[PDB]
Every structure is written in structure tokens, then in C-alpha cells.
Write an enzyme that holds these catalytic residues in place. Structure first.
Site, mmCIF file in Angstrom:
data_model
loop_
_atom_site.group_PDB
_atom_site.id
_atom_site.type_symbol
_atom_site.label_atom_id
_atom_site.label_comp_id
_atom_site.label_asym_id
_atom_site.label_seq_id
_atom_site.Cartn_x
_atom_site.Cartn_y
_atom_site.Cartn_z
ATOM 1 C CG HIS A 46 2.106 3.456 3.134
ATOM 2 N ND1 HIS A 46 1.228 4.366 3.637
ATOM 3 C CD2 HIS A 46 2.871 3.020 4.155
ATOM 4 C CE1 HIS A 46 1.465 4.441 4.926
ATOM 5 N NE2 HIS A 46 2.449 3.660 5.314
ATOM 6 C CG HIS A 48 -2.206 3.984 -0.778
ATOM 7 N ND1 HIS A 48 -3.230 4.092 0.137
ATOM 8 C CD2 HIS A 48 -1.089 4.368 -0.087
ATOM 9 C CE1 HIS A 48 -2.737 4.547 1.282
ATOM 10 N NE2 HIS A 48 -1.439 4.717 1.214
ATOM 11 C CG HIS A 63 -1.107 0.568 3.107
ATOM 12 N ND1 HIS A 63 -0.317 0.502 4.205
ATOM 13 C CD2 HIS A 63 -1.716 1.812 3.131
ATOM 14 C CE1 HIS A 63 -0.410 1.607 4.933
ATOM 15 N NE2 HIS A 63 -1.266 2.399 4.279
ATOM 16 C CG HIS A 71 0.970 -1.299 7.870
ATOM 17 N ND1 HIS A 71 1.198 -0.684 6.659
ATOM 18 C CD2 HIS A 71 1.616 -0.613 8.855
ATOM 19 C CE1 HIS A 71 1.979 0.368 6.936
ATOM 20 N NE2 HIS A 71 2.250 0.452 8.251
ATOM 21 C CG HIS A 80 0.279 -3.891 3.538
ATOM 22 N ND1 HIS A 80 -0.225 -2.787 4.227
ATOM 23 C CD2 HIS A 80 -0.432 -4.932 3.979
ATOM 24 C CE1 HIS A 80 -1.206 -3.155 5.021
ATOM 25 N NE2 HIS A 80 -1.361 -4.477 4.872
ATOM 26 C CG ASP A 83 3.372 -1.661 4.366
ATOM 27 O OD1 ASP A 83 2.492 -0.882 3.969
ATOM 28 O OD2 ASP A 83 3.155 -2.670 5.065
ATOM 29 C CG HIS A 120 -0.003 8.485 5.143
ATOM 30 N ND1 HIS A 120 -1.370 8.291 5.186
ATOM 31 C CD2 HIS A 120 0.475 7.518 4.313
ATOM 32 C CE1 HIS A 120 -1.688 7.251 4.401
ATOM 33 N NE2 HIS A 120 -0.573 6.749 3.853
ATOM 34 N NE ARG A 143 -5.315 7.243 2.198
ATOM 35 C CZ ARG A 143 -5.823 6.242 1.467
ATOM 36 N NH1 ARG A 143 -6.113 6.351 0.171
ATOM 37 N NH2 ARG A 143 -6.050 5.085 2.100
HETATM 38 CU CU CU Z 1 -0.264 5.178 2.687
HETATM 39 ZN ZN ZN Z 2 0.733 -1.082 4.768
#
Ligand code: CU
Ligand code: ZN
Ligand code: CU
Ligand code: ZN
Lengths: 153, 153
Positions: A46, A48, A63, A71, A80, A83, A120, A143
Site C-alpha cells: 500500500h 501510506h 494507508h 480499506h 483507500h 490500496d 507487509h 511493515r
Molecule cells: Cu500498508
Molecule cells: Zn487500505
């Protein structure tokens, strides 16, 4: 316009994510090469909110979600902006691929230039899980690597 | 608006550079803390064009110079947008300080969000040297650390 994020961390995961967008209304092409992931898996990926690397990957924030949606999967209309779903990893732990996205932009008031990319350690459940957490993070977990998105050419 | 760059490299120099700008026409406050420099020295300090960390500090490119001027001191009218002069280092190799600048912006078409900060291994001659090179880089030498400038809050 082109941008790039170099993903780094202390967990053995690292990579490079490239962005290209011709004009603001056109899709952004996102391409990535990421090493050191679990093999044969799917890993949450994603944009951020913050391009802030002062505290590992924590200071990237949540995010990127200027439109205050839940999400979701990239192909969901409720998602998001940041995403990017899961990236697939091969038997060697490598994720390599590309896609187009019409919410992610390098131009205009939702530009992701100056924000971060995070890869992730777990699978993103795409907002479809049991939890209130599914609607926030997809339950994608830790992360292991991240990078600030910068302009390039 | 706030931004930050985390300066890293393999040369022992590292640090954090913060930016804050209230609105596009007002000065940006730049503050920095940088460790591991030569002691009791002056070290060149600039915004470079690209936020590209794919090749150390090389891929940051040249000084950010949208107006196609020569390299100069911060208080010169003729300077690159990215020219932040020298920072002074103490007996322990630490540079810590802050300043205001009216060409550096976090807002608008010259925003440095998504570009890079570089701290150099040598002194910036502020464009006053005997060289074509003085008018390009200030002869500030190597790039022991750099970081992409990201949005924060
Ligand atoms: Cu993320
Ligand atoms: Zn998200
Ligand atoms: Cu420089
Ligand atoms: Zn310059």
C-alpha cells in the site's frame, strides 16, 4: 511524470517500486521488484500517508485515504487511494509485477509523491475479514520494508 | 505544511532535516541535525532535483534549479533554488541549526516535496571560485548522505 520508492528495512525485505503517469486523469503504472519475502505467498502492498522515515516504517502512518473510505481491494470502488492489494511472491521470495491504477496519481492534490510505499509481512484480506481492523489495514500485519516516493525522470 | 528528509549513507554521516512552510509565498523554515561529519568545518548542503535513491546519492541528480541560474549562496539573488550554503560542524562533527528561505517551498510548482537533500563531504565555495564547476556545484565534493523529502505532519 515518474516517481520511485526504494524499499528498505531490517527484516531482509527490500525492493524498488516505480510509478509513471502521463497526465492527472490517466492511470498510473506501478511496477515493482521486491526480494526477501516469504515464498509462495501474498503480501499486502500500500501507499501510506506520510513520507516520514524518522521511525522505521511506523512513521509512514496509515494507508493514504484522503477520501475517508474503508480499506478494500484495488478493483473495489470503495477502497483507500493507497490500496494496492497483495503482491504474489514466488518460490524464491521475489515479487515482480506491474499494474495500472486510476486512484493513484503523481499529479494533483492526491499525488503520492512525498508519501511512502510499504510492503507487509502478511496477506491483505482486502477488507473482507471479520474485524474492524480488516476495514482499516486489511490485517496485513507488520511493515518489514518501506520507502519514500520521490520524483525522478 | 511539514516535510522531512532522513539523511543516510555508508560514510558515517546521518541526520534529519525538517521543513515547515505555512503558505506558498512565505519562507520555509529548514532545521537540521546531522552527525558524523568532519569536525570544525563547513559542509555544503543542498536540495537536489530528484527523490531517486536507486543509486546511492548519485541518483538525486544535480542541484534543484528550475530557474536555470548559477550556483550561489543562500543570500544571493542568483542561486539555485536548492542552494542551502554550508552548515557548520562542531568539535564532535555535529551540524545543528535552522534557517528561513524564500526560494525553497513545500507548496506549488517548485515544491521540494519528493526531491532530495544532500549533505556533502566538502565546503561549498558558494559559486565564488575559479571554476565552471564552482557555478555548478560550488565544488562541495562527495555526497556522503542524502534522503528523499517526504510529507509529514
Ligand atoms: Cu500498508
Ligand atoms: Zn487500505
Ligand atoms: Cu548538493
Ligand atoms: Zn547549487
Amino acid at each position: 511524470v515518474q516517481a520511485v520508492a526504494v524499499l528498505k528495512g531490517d527484516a531482509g525485505v527490500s525492493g524498488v517500486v516505480k510509478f509513471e503517469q502521463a497526465s492527472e486523469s490517466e492511470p498510473t503504472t506501478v511496477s515493482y521488484e521486491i526480494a526477501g519475502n516469504s515464498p509462495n505467498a501474498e503480501r499486502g502492498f500500500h501507499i501510506h500517508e506520510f513520507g516520514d522515515a524518522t521511525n522505521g516504517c511506523v512513521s509512514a502512518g496509515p494507508h493514504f485515504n484522503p477520501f475517508k473510505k474503508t480499506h478494500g481491494a484495488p478493483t473495489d470502488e470503495v477502497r483507500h487511494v493507497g490500496d494496492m492489494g497483495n503482491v504474489k511472491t514466488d518460490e524464491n521470495g521475489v515479487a515482480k509485477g506491474s499494474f495500472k491504477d486510476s486512484l493513484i496519481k503523481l499529479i494533483g492534490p492526491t499525488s503520492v509523491v512525498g508519501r511512502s510505499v510499504v510492503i507487509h509481512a502478511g496477506q491483505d484480506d482486502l477488507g473482507k475479514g471479520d474485524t474492524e481492523e480488516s476495514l482499516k489495514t486489511g490485517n496485513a500485519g507488520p511493515r518489514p520494508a518501506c520507502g519514500v516516493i520521490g520524483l525522478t525522470n
